[PDB]
RNA sequence: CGAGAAUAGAAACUCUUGAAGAAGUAAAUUAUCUACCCGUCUUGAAACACGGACCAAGGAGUCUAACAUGGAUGCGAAUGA
RNA sequence: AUAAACAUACUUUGAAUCGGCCAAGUCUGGUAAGCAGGACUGGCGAUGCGGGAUGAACCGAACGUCGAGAUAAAGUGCCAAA
RNA sequence: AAAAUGAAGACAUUUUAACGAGUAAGGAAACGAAAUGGCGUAAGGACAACAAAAGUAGUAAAGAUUUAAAGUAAUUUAGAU
């Protein structure tokens, strides 16, 4: 009955499916990543409580990179972080009256 | 329990306006009424002769006949479950021109000016102007942007109670 | 074939106070009193005949066997339903003698018509 | 209870349209929050809905809802006698959390329904600035007490049998 | 012969494509304006809603004659009946007068679609015929350039030029029951009650009533 | 319930031939069929006027037919009522279709060279109605209408049913 | 990947009970819920308001005459006789 | 602006009725009254159903015969569904 | 209520839609798409086995007592005595 009333249902259902299928895969291909960054910060923890933990000076860079990006994108990460810091300061000042 | 006098309960209805006693303006007897005009009946207690009944006070009627000294007025009167037509003959002292059509006659003139320009434009071949838009109730105002360079903020909060004594 | 005959109320609409007084019979009469417990439709006593109780138009006046009753007084009156033996059923009148009943009962067997009084006034 | 940040402007002859009113309203939803804002504008600035425009009604969320803070609330309520100004102190982790405590407490101790209380302002004070006779005993570092007469806890309604077996006992926890 | 069925189906798709373009394009402009106004540090004032849905909350017993007439003018003649109303100075005042007997608010697009698809109907020859095909919608509203159900939804949501003719053809929706209020329907929704202006929160109520 | 202004009551329009006249029943059958199929407003009009009561179908005399047919020489006057004869004035040549013709009216119309038709012939000849003129008689000429109202009224008094000592 | 369209494809079943009484219906009893005395005057009666012990038969808008409206009928400047 | 074709305008003939009663973000006489009398609206009378234990008027809501669900007033220790 | 069909079927046609509380009171008969639909008492004029012996009845009428069936109901129908 929906097709009889709205023939556009077939166009926005197949195309809706392809949105769903890929969007589900993005969850998977963000969990594999967040498995590395979660299994690269374990071997920066059980390697830091273990020996060093006074001898509180522990190495600053026990966390290791897992996804590689070009130098230009590295500059954009610090550009983005500056913007979101400004946005947080922009909002906090506003609601603080 | 009131009485059935012709002018009962007129201590405040028939009183003259404050500092408005004495004679009336001469525009009252100089204004020209034509059949079809809209008038408002306003009893003038200073002229006891031909005083219209107090139930017609402030009623807006139409002029249906013009006699040498009196103006005929046609007003609606409510009866048990129906409306009847009342035809009076009132001297010009007890009536007043009505502005009930003040704005309607202004929008009549606006459409007449446009129509007059349209016939000239059609002769010239150029496109005609559109008629004025109809009046509408207050519409939902559209989205607007506010420039913050000249914007001042004042906080609003509940006020501490202060005694009036 | 036979449709499912559905009755919305299988009881009887008895008269008000018919159970208490023997002069008030059980035939229904709508109470017209000004303080009547029934016509005011109180709780408990709110059972009145209404048009909504009527049975389906398809199966109205249909006997449980699935056929419509048709009274016959003689063998000739059977010939009026011999074309509709799948719709009507014969019914010998209560005043038809036993001799005329045998002719009606025999003839209906010839014409294949169902008779509902086939066991009436049978001899000893 | 939710906190909202509301702004509006007045476009008419009396008020110039370059003055923006702000407020932080505590309300169960944004519809109630707007109503408290419009009445505040009308009773203090003669600004009415039919002659003003609303701009923002965004919510305000607690920045760190994991830090225990001593909140101080300045409010005014109406009793049988007259109108009074009160100042109460509560220990909670969210601004909307303490206001929920304030409304319940006021309706209990003073028998004052919500529609008689106006919250002027809510702030945060230090540890030693709490003067509540009961709450002053928990602001310290070394608070300690045994919870006695514990009723045994049920994991869920699944095991809530009406009749039990054997004797019953409380817990010293 | 029946080759017009193929042409009609294609035409409906073109109308549907065009309508979804207008709704999506207007959504982007509002989002872009809000985004840009934040970058500039400016203030953006949203536009007032143009469409309003109202539900009759109370029964037919104990209504003053003034309220009785207004509810008849809005076609809210039965409890749990919903209609679409234009927003202006006249209608908003009419809804304020009958506030205790109605709850109303601003519908979302998905709310409009579900009401029209599930509870939609038309008054054809004085008969309340439920919507079953585009042929009957074309027959009733073809003169008003509304030839499919998605034209009908778009016109209601955006309040087009022919809203009055389209809205008047739509029979008042008959809704189910749902939890009316927190305390009761004898107080305003602002007080936690049932009647009054719920604004966009009316969509939660309509979700349980459709 | 539902707040309806008023409940459903029978619409006060007659849709069949009043009485047990077998021929008038067939005429309504004929024109109810003609109006339904041809969808002509003429057959709809004739069918509606065939179903009025006798008092609402007043007579039309030959004088009225003559005056109304003056500038319609080759036409067929159609009046759904009895056609009486006006002996004061002559009858010209014309064709009339009517429910019933008075014995003298039929002779006068015929003797002048005209024709007296029935409604069945008219449908056979002019079903949708092409050379016809629709005519109905006067309703206010009834004497009963004189006594309706209040005879004490200042504007349009009634006419005082006569009785005991009426002066 | 894919809407339209053109071209080809596919659905006829199992078990149990019943003239040793199935489904339904009816009567009696039991059990849960439910139920104040009918008629009448009255703003209001189950009323501490009146009539009613029970049953059968009888029992109350009719007939003549004048007028009016109205629906069916005949004739129609006539109709009735 | 909104609503309105089983809309609108009625015409004719006629029934019953003009003992009323209640509520109140109302008023007058009275110390006061389940007192007497009024303005506006809604009800009871003419009205059953769910709730207030019970009740002419209170709250919800007005009724063809049934099945399934979401509800309203209002409630969830037992009588009593939660 | 509106469409469709319509000399005879039949269940007072077919379809769609809206509706259905009620004291006093009204809705006489007839009217094919019927201007509400029906039950019962008694008497008068007809009709009742169509092929020249034409409704039932001593092969058991009316009535009475009950058992069942049809109808929302007024009531009707049939069995047994």
DSSP annotation of E162 reads T
Is residue A95 less than 8 Å (CB to CB) from chain D? yes
C-alpha span between D129 and D71 (Å, rounded): 10
Q: Which residues of E touch B140 (CB under 8 A)?
A: 47-50, 87-88
D111: Cβ–Cβ under 8 A, 6 or more apart, which residues? Answer: none
DSSP string, chain A: -HHHH-GGGTHHHHHHHHHHHHHHHHHHHHHTHHHHHHHSSSTTTTTTTTTT-------TT-S---S---HHHHHHHHHHHHHHHHHHHHHHHHHT-
F60-61 vs F76-84, strand pairing mode:
parallel
Protein CA at C39 to nucleotide C1' at G50, angstroms: 23
Backbone φ/ψ region at F59: left (φ over 0), alpha (ψ -120 to 50), beta = beta
Tokens for C78? Answer: 């059977």
Distance (Å) of CA A86 to CA A96, B146, D146, E44, F44: 15, 22, 48, 20, 82
Q: What is the 3-state secondary structure (H, E, C) of D11-36?
A: CCCCCCCCEEEEEEEEECCHHHHHHH
d(CA C70, CA C79): 12
Chain center to CA of E45: 24
Q: Rounded distance, CA B46 to CA B22, Å? A: 8
CA distance C88 to E152: 55
- Across E11-146, the runs of DSSP E, i.e. the strands, are 43-45, 51-56, 81-86, 102-105, 121-124, 127-130
CB F79 within 8 A of CB F136: yes
**CA D65, D67, D68, D73 torsion: positive or negative?**
negative
How many residues appear in chain E?
210
Q: CB burial class (10 A; 0-12, 13-18, 19+) of residue B42?
A: middle
Given in angstroms, what resolution was this structure solved at? 3.0
CA-to-C1' distance for B4 and H47, Å? Answer: 43
Smallest CA–CA separation between A22 and chain D, in Å? 33
> CA–C1' span, E184 to H75, in Å?
13
Question: What secondary structure does DSSP assign to D95-153, as a single string?
Answer: HHHHHHHHHHHHHHHS---GGGEEEEEEEEE-STT---TTGGGTSSS-------SBPPP
In contact, D51 and D10? CB cutoff 8 Å:
yes
Measured CA to CA, the distance from residue C94 to residue C100 in angstroms comes to 12
Interface contacts E/F by beta carbons within 8 Å: 15
Residue F155 to residue B87: CA distance in whole angstroms: 15
DSSP F67: H
The answer to whether B70 and B89 have CB atoms below 8 angstroms apart is: yes
Give the β-pairing of D83-92 and D2-10: unpaired
Query: Strands B95-97, B38-41: parallel, antiparallel or unpaired by DSSP?
Result: antiparallel
Label the pairing between strands E173-174 and F95-101.
unpaired
What's the count of helices (H) and strands (E) in chain E, helices before strands?
A: 8, 8
Phi and psi based region of residue F67 (left: phi greater than 0; alpha: psi -120 to 50; beta: remaining): alpha
Burial class from Cβ neighbours inside 10 Å (0-12, 13-18, 19+) for residue B127 reads exposed
CA distance E92 to chain B (A): 10
Distance F155 CA to G68 C1' (A): 23
Q: Which residues of B touch E44 (CB under 8 A)?
A: 143, 145-146
Residue D141 distance to chain B (closest CA, Å): 35
- How many Å from the CA of F148 to C1' of H59? 53
A96 CB-to-strand G distance under 7 Å: no
User: What is the phi-psi region of residue D149: left when phi exceeds 0, alpha when psi lies from -120 to 50, beta otherwise?
Assistant: left
- Torsion sign over Cα D104, D110, D112, D114: negative
* Cα torsion through D108, D114, D119, D124, rounded to 10: 40
Give the residue on D whose Cα is nearest the Cα of E202.
Answer: D31
What's the farthest any 2 CA atoms get from each other in chain D?
81
Residue F1: strand, helix, or coil: coil
Among the partner-chain residues D35, D54, D55, the one whose CB lies closest to the CB of E190 is D35
Q: List subunits contacting chain B, requiring 3 or more Cβ pairs under 8 Å.
A: D, E
Count CA atoms closer than 13 A to F146's CA, side-chain side: 7
Q: Check CB contact under 8 Å for B138 and E88.
A: yes
Give the nearest chain E residue to F2 (CA atoms). E78
Among candidates E55, E41, E67, E69, which has minimal Cα distance to E177? Answer: E55
Q: Give the Cα separation of F87 and F115 in Å (integer).
A: 18
For D55, which of E43, E189, E192 is closest by C-beta distance? E43
Q: Integer distance in angstroms from CA E9 to C1' G6?
A: 17
Strand D83-92 to D69-78 pairing: antiparallel
Cβ(E95)–Cβ(E71) below 8 Å: no
Closest Cα in chain B to D24: B157
The CA–CA distances, whole Å, from C30 to C21, C40, C46 equal: 17, 11, 12
Query: d(Cα D39, Cα D28) in Å, to the nearest integer?
Result: 17
Nearest to B40 by CA among B92, B103, B104, B108: B92
Rounded to a whole number of angstroms, the distance from the CA of D133 to the nearest CA of chain B is 25
CA distance E180 to D147: 43
Contacts with F99 (C-beta within 8 Å, 6 or more apart), sequence order: F24, F57, F80, F81, F82, F118, F119
Closest Cα to residue A92, out of D55, D54, D71, D62? D62
φ/ψ of D153, rounded to 5, equals -95, 145
Q: What 3-state class would DSSP assign to B147?
A: coil
| Chain F: partners with 3+ C-beta pairs within 8 Å | E
- F115-117 and E121-124 strand pairing: unpaired
Chains C and B touch (3+ CB pairs under 8 A): no
Residue E50, phi then psi, degrees to nearest 5: -100, -20
| Nearest to F79, CA basis, from F141, F136, F139, F119 | F136
Reading the block at residue D54, the tokens are 């609303």
For residue C81, the number of C-alpha atoms closer than 13 Å in the C-beta half-sphere is 24
* Nearest nucleotide, CA C58 to C1': I11
DSSP E173: E
CA of F98 to C1' of I30 (A): 25
Q: Which nucleotide is nearest to E128 (CA to C1')?
A: I17
Phi and psi (nearest 5°) for E31?
-65, -45
Tokens of B23: 């004679």
Separation in Å, CA A74 to CA A30, A38, C59, D76, E17: 20, 21, 85, 55, 42
Instruction: Find residues 2-61 of chain F whose CB sits inside 8 Å of chain E.
Output: 2-5
- What element of type H or E holds E197? strand E196-197
Nearest nucleotide over every DNA/RNA strand to the C15 CA, judged by C1': I73
Spell out which residues of A between 16 and 45 contact strand G, using CB within 7 Å. Answer: 18
Two structure tokens written together for C91: 């019914």
**Structure-token pair, residue F163:** 């009785």
Which of the residues E88, E93, E94, E96 would you substitute to probe the B interface, choosing the one with the greatest number of B C-beta atoms within 10 Å? Answer: E88
- Checking E29-32 for CB contacts under 8 A at 24+ apart, the result is E30/B143
User: What residue has token string 């719920």?
Assistant: E198
CA D152 to CA E194: how far, in whole Å?
A: 41
Distance (Å, rounded) from C-alpha B36 to C-alpha B101?
Answer: 12
Residue E13, SS3 per DSSP:
helix
Contacts of E15 (CB under 8 A, 6+ apart): E147, E148, E150, E151
Q: Are D72 and D87 contacting, i.e. CB atoms less than 8 angstroms apart?
A: yes
What residues form DSSP beta bridges with B87?
B74
**D55 contacts in E (CB within 8 Å)?**
43-46
Contact predicate B91/B39, CB 8 Å: no
Residue nearest to nucleotide I30 (CA to C1'): F19
- Closest by Cα among F98, F95, F63 to F79: F98
Which of D53, D77, D99, D102 should we substitute to test contact with B (largest number of B Cβ atoms within 10 Å)?
D53
The first and second tokens of residue E64, run together, are: 């003053």
**Contact assessment for residue D89 and residue D132, using Cβ atoms and an 8 Å cutoff:** yes
Q: How far apart are CA E80 and CA E53, in angstroms?
A: 12
> Chain D: nearest CA to B103, how far in angstroms?
24
F161 touches strand G (CB under 7 A): yes
Length of chain B: 165
Which of chain D's residues have a Cβ under 8 Å away from the Cβ of B153?
Answer: 19-22
CA separation for the pair F158, A73 (Å, rounded): 105
Question: What residues of D are in the B interface, CB distance below 8 Å?
Answer: 9, 18-23, 37, 40-41, 44-45, 50, 53, 55, 74, 76, 83-85, 118-121
Q: State CA C2 to chain mean position distance.
A: 18
Supply the Cα-derived Rg of chain F in whole angstroms: 20
d(CA F160, CA F167): 10
Asked whether the beta carbons of residue E191 and residue D30 sit closer than 8 angstroms, the reply is no
Distance F126 CA to G70 C1' (A): 36
Strand partners, D6: D23, D57
Nucleotide nearest to C46 in CA–C1' terms: H48
Length C15 CA → I76 C1' (Å): 19
Residues in chain B with CB shorter than 8 Å from the CB of E89 are 137-138
Could you give phi then psi for residue C3, rounded to 5 degrees? -75, 160
CA distance E199 to D39: 17
Q: Do E88 and B145 touch (CB under 8 A)?
A: no
Whether E69 has its CB under 8 Å from any CB of chain F: the answer is no
Which CB contacts under 8 angstroms, 24+ apart, belong to C102-109? Answer: C103/C74, C103/C75, C104/C72, C104/C74, C104/C75, C104/C78, C107/C75, C107/C78, C108/C78
C-alpha dihedral, F25 to F29 to F32 to F36, nearest 10°: 170
Residues 6+ away with beta carbon under 8 Å from B109: none
Q: Cβ B156–D55 below 8 Å, yes or no?
A: no
Q: What 3-state class would DSSP assign to C92?
A: strand
> For residue F105, with 0-12 CB atoms within 10 Å meaning exposed, 13-18 middle and 19 or more buried, which class applies?
buried
Tokens at F122, concatenated:
């008219």
Measured in angstroms, the CA of D161 and the nearest CA of chain A are apart by 43
- Cα B140–B146–B152 angle (5° rounding)? 120
Instruction: Look up tokens 């002229």; give the residue.
Output: B47
Measuring CA to CA, which residue among D72, D92, D86, D96 is closest to residue D116?
A: D86
């Amino acid at each position: 009955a929906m097709v009889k009333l709205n023939p556009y249902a077939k166009i926005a259902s197949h195309k809706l499916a392809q949105v769903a299928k890929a969007q589900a895969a993005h969850k998977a291909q963000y969990a594999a990543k967040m498995e590395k960054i979660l299994a690269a910060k374990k071997e920066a923890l059980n390697q830091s409580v273990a020996k060093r933990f006074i001898k509180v000076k522990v190495e600053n860079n026990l966390l290791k990179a897992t996804v590689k990006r070009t130098a230009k994108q590295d500059a954009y990460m610090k550009k983005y972080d500056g913007i979101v810091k400004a946005n947080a300061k922009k909002y906090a000042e506003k609601i603080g009256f | 329990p009131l009485s059935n006098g012709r002018n009962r309960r007129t201590r405040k209805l028939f009183k003259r306006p404050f500092r408005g006693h004495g004679l009336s303006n001469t525009s009252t007897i100089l204004h020209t009424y034509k059949v079809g005009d809209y008038v408002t009946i306003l009893c003038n207690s200073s002229i006891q002769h031909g005083l219209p009944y107090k139930a017609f006070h402030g009623k807006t009627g139409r002029v249906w006949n013009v006699n040498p000294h009196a103006i005929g007025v046609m007003v609606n009167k409510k009866v048990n479950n129906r409306i009847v037509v009342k035809r009076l003959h009132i001297s010009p002292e007890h009536i007043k021109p009505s502005g009930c059509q003040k704005d309607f006659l202004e929008r009549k003139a606006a459409v007449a000016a446009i129509r007059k320009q349209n016939i000239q434009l059609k002769k010239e071949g150029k496109p005609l102007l559109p008629l004025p838009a109809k009046r509408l109730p207050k519409q939902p105002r559209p989205a607007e942007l506010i420039k913050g360079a000249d914007i001042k903020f004042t906080t609003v909060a509940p006020l501490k109670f202060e005694e009036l004594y | 074939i036979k449709p499912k005959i559905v009755k919305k109320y299988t009881g009887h609409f008895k008269r008000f106070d018919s159970n208490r007084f023997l002069r008030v019979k059980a035939s229904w009469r709508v109470p017209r009193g000004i303080d009547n417990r029934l016509r005011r439709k109180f709780k408990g006593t709110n059972l009145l005949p209404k048009i909504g109780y009527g049975s389906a138009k398809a199966t109205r006046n249909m006997l449980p066997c699935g056929l419509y009753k048709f009274p016959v007084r003689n063998t000739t009156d059977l010939e009026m339903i011999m074309m509709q033996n799948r719709k009507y059923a014969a019914e010998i009148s209560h005043a038809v003698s036993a001799k005329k009943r045998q002719e009606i009962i025999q003839r209906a067997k010839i014409l294949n018509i169902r008779v509902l009084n086939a066991d009436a006034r049978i001899k000893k | 209870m939710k906190e909202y940040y509301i702004t509006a402007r007045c476009t008419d002859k009396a008020h110039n349209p370059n003055e923006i009113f702000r407020s932080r309203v505590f309300a169960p939803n944004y519809v109630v929050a707007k109503s408290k804002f419009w009445m505040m504008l009308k009773k203090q600035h003669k600004v009415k809905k039919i002659n003003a425009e609303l701009l923002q009604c965004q919510p305000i969320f607690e920045k760190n809802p994991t830090v225990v803070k001593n909140y101080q609330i300045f409010l005014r309520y109406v009793s049988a006698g007259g109108i009074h100004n009160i100042t109460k102190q509560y220990r909670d982790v969210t601004r909307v959390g303490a206001v929920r405590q304030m409304y319940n407490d006021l309706a209990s101790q003073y028998r004052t329904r919500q529609d008689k209380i106006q919250l002027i302002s809510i702030t945060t004070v230090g540890d030693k600035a709490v003067k509540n006779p009961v709450l002053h005993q928990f602001v310290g570092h070394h608070v300690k007490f045994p919870m006695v007469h514990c009723k045994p806890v049920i994991a869920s309604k699944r095991f809530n049998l009406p009749i039990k077996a054997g004797k019953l006992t409380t817990k010293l926890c | 012969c029946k080759a017009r069925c193929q042409a009609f189906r294609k035409e409906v798709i073109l109308r549907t494509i065009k309508n979804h373009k207008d709704i999506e394009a207007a959504k982007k402009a509002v989002y872009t304006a809000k985004k840009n106004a934040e970058i500039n540090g400016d203030l953006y004032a949203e536009a007032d809603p143009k469409l309003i849905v109202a539900i009759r909350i109370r029964g037919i017993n104990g209504v003053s004659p003034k309220i009785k007439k207004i509810l008849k003018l809005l076609r809210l003649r039965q409890i749990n009946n919903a209609v679409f109303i234009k927003a202006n100075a006249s209608t908003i005042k009419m809804l304020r007068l009958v506030d205790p007997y109605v709850t109303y608010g601003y519908p979302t697009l998905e709310t409009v679609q579900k009401l029209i698809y599930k509870r939609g109907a038309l008054k054809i020859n004085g008969n309340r015929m439920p919507i079953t095909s585009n042929c009957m919608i074309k027959k009733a509203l073809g003169d008003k350039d509304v030839v499919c159900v998605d034209d009908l939804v778009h016109e209601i949501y955006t309040v087009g030029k022919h809203f009055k003719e389209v809205n008047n053809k739509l029979a008042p929706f008959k809704l189910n029951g749902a939890k009316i209020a927190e305390k009761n329907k004898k107080i305003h929704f602002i007080l936690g009650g049932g009647f009054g202006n719920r604004e966009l929160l009316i969509n939660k109520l309509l979700a349980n009533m459709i | 319930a539902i707040d309806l202004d008023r409940h459903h009551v029978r619409k006060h329009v007659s849709k069949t031939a009043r009485g047990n006249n077998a021929y008038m029943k067939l005429l309504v059958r004929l024109y109810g069929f003609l109006a339904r199929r041809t969808q002509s407003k003429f057959a709809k009009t004739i069918l509606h006027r065939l179903c009025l009561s006798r008092v609402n179908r007043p007579i039309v005399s030959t004088s009225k037919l003559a005056c109304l047919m003056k500038k319609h020489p080759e036409e067929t006057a159609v009046c759904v009522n009895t056609v009486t004869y006006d002996s004061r004035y002559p009858v010209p040549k014309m064709n009339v279709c009517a429910l019933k013709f008075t014995k003298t009216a039929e002779a006068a119309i015929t003797k002048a060279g005209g024709k007296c038709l029935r409604f069945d012939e008219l449908a056979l000849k002019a079903p949708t109605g092409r050379k016809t003129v629709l005519i109905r008689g006067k309703r206010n000429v009834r004497e009963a209408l004189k006594h309706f109202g209040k005879v004490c009224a200042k504007k349009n008094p009634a006419k005082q049913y006569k009785g005991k000592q009426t002066k």
